[PDB]
Amino acid sequence: QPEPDMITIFIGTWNMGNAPPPKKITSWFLSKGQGKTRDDSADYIPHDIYVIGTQEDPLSEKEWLEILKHSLQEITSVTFKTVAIHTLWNIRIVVLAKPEHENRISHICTDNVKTGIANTLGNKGAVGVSFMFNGTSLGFVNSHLTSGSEKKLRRNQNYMNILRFLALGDKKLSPFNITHRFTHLFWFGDLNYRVDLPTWEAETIIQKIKQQQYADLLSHDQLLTERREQKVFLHFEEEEITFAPTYRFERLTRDKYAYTKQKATGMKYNLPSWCDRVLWKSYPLVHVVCQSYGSTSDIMTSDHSPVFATFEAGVTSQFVSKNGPGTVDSQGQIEFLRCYATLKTKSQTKFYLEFHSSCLESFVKSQEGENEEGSEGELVVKFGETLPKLKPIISDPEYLLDQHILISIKSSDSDESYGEGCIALRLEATETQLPIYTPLTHHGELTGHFQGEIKLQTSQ
Numbered sequence: 001q002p003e004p005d006m007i008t009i010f011i012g013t014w015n016m017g018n019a020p021p022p023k024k025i026t027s028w029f030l031s032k033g034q035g036k037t038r039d040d041s042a043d044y045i046p047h048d049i050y051v052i053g054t055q056e057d058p059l060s061e062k063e064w065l066e067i068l069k070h071s072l073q074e075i076t077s078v079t080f081k082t083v084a085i086h087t088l089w090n091i092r093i094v095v096l097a098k099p100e101h102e103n104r105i106s107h108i109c110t111d112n113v114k115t116g117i118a119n120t121l122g123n124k125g126a127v128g129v130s131f132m133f134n135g136t137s138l139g140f141v142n143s144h145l146t147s148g149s150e151k152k153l154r155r156n157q158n159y160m161n162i163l164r165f166l167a168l169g170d171k172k173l174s175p176f177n178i179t180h181r182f183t184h185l186f187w188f189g190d191l192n193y194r195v196d197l198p199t200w201e202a203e204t205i206i207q208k209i210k211q212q213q214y215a216d217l218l219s220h221d222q223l224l225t226e227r228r229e230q231k232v233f234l235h236f237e238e239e240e241i242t243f244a245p246t247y248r249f250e251r252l253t254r255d256k257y258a259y260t261k262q263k264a265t266g267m268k269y270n271l272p273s274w275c276d277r278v279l280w281k282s283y284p285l286v287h288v289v290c291q292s293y294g295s296t297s298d299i300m301t302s303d304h305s306p307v308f309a310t311f312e313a314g315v316t317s318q319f320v321s322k323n324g325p326g327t328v329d330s331q332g333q334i335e336f337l338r339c340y341a342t343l344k345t346k347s348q349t350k351f352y353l354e355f356h357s358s359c360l361e362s363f364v365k366s367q368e369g370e371n372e373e374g375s376e377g378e379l380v381v382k383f384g385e386t387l388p389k390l391k392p393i394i395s396d397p398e399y400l401l402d403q404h405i406l407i408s409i410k411s412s413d414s415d416e417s418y419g420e421g422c423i424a425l426r427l428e429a430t431e432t433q434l435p436i437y438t439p440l441t442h443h444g445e446l447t448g449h450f451q452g453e454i455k456l457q458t459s460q
């Protein structure tokens with residue numbers, strides 16, 4: 001029975017509005033409704049992994065797991081295995097997988113982050129799960145960010161706190177946050193970003209939605225505009241939105257958006273908005289394709305509609321050779337030529353690099369770089385030809401070309417990372433000098449870039 005090269009992953013996000021679900025929710029898991037929907041001919045084909053994010057979830061874990069499992073069993077005739085479930089207040093994540101995957105899944109981690117302080121600490125935050133699927137690391141974040149049209153900067157702050165403090169994945173990757181720890185990271189939830197148009201335009205917006213004309217609304221979507229301005233979700237992707245706003249509906253129908261200010265809303269307007277979102281970030285040159293992104297039309301217990309997204313994701317096998325794991329494979333090496341880091345910092349410490357990769361027995365520390373003053377005031381840290389030669393555990397090109405090197409640039413004075421990035425070994429050639437590049441981020445904000453050349457030697 002061969003190991004898979006690709007799996008499909010279902011991501012769902014639903015703010016349940018503190019109400020129990022209706023008796024049938026299969027349309028969610030089938031990617032049926034509005035937007036980019038799944039072909040009917042696939043209805044009986046199970047996804048490999050289902051990741052369900054809820055917000056304002058009133059059910060117990062037991063209650064929701066029985067609904068989810070019975071739903072999937074009705075669709076597929078498969079009894080899914082529970083990988084992980086984690087709940088913070090009313091924010092929940094469930095991961096289910098086909099039983100055949102049980103002995104492919106390991107290193108399961110869960111964590112949560114509570115956002116805010118005093119007044120704003122006690123219901124918003126995030127839950128997440130990570131695990132290894134054979135040779136591939138997967139991370140999943142369900143966040144419920146701050147509500148309200150005039151709180152986009154709070155949402156951006158909530159995002160930064162979640163990616164700084166959520167402790168998932170390999171703890172040896174100590175300079176790296178969740179935006180660098182996983183081959184594939186999916187971040188979804190009630191992100192709560194709104195369509196920023198004047199309150200007076202509510203009925204105009206409703207009109208546009210009835211005509212399925214979303215362009216003039218999406219051009220004012222706060223998540224799209226903040227992403228464009230590099231204020232949040234830097235280096236994440238989102239599929240084009242082709243479904244109506246998923247909030248705020250009158251319950252028990254989808255015929256009416258309830259936008260007007262009421263005592264129950266704190267006298268705030270809730271103009272129709274795409275609160276409910278799925279984004280992803282995968283390592284460079286790894287296969288990831290969004291197959292569906294949409295909302296259901298027939299699940300009406302909440303003031304939000306459920307959102308679905310599905311992906312075809314590249315995975316790799318748990319490689320064994322005669323040599324690695326547990327020794328090096330002299331026949332492999334990774335070399336770096338003409339490398340330099342450019343950093344936005346005003347600081348003047350010396351810097352060194354750390355190279356982290358599961359193709360190495362342990363991380364590798366470089367010598368200090370040579371600081372130069374760049375022509376437009378920036379800091380250039382030159383490594384030239386001084387970087388160590390990295391010694392992978394396995395030299396087989398079928399393994400090595402699928403790997404990645406994480407890079408941290410650290411201060412010699414504090415050993416704090418000033419920037420993190422990632423280089424793919426999926427090169428156009430071996431034994432050949434080729435350009436490499438990554439942006440560098442810290443706390444998920446841009447701090448610089450690293451570029452140079454690489455030369456990869458495999459056993460072939």
Ligand SMILES: Cc1cncc(NCc2ccncc2)c1
Pocket residue numbers: 224227228237
């Ligand atoms: C509008 C916007 C927001 N955030 C990032 C970008 N980058 C360009 C891009 C990103 C994905 N795929 C193709 C092109 C663009």
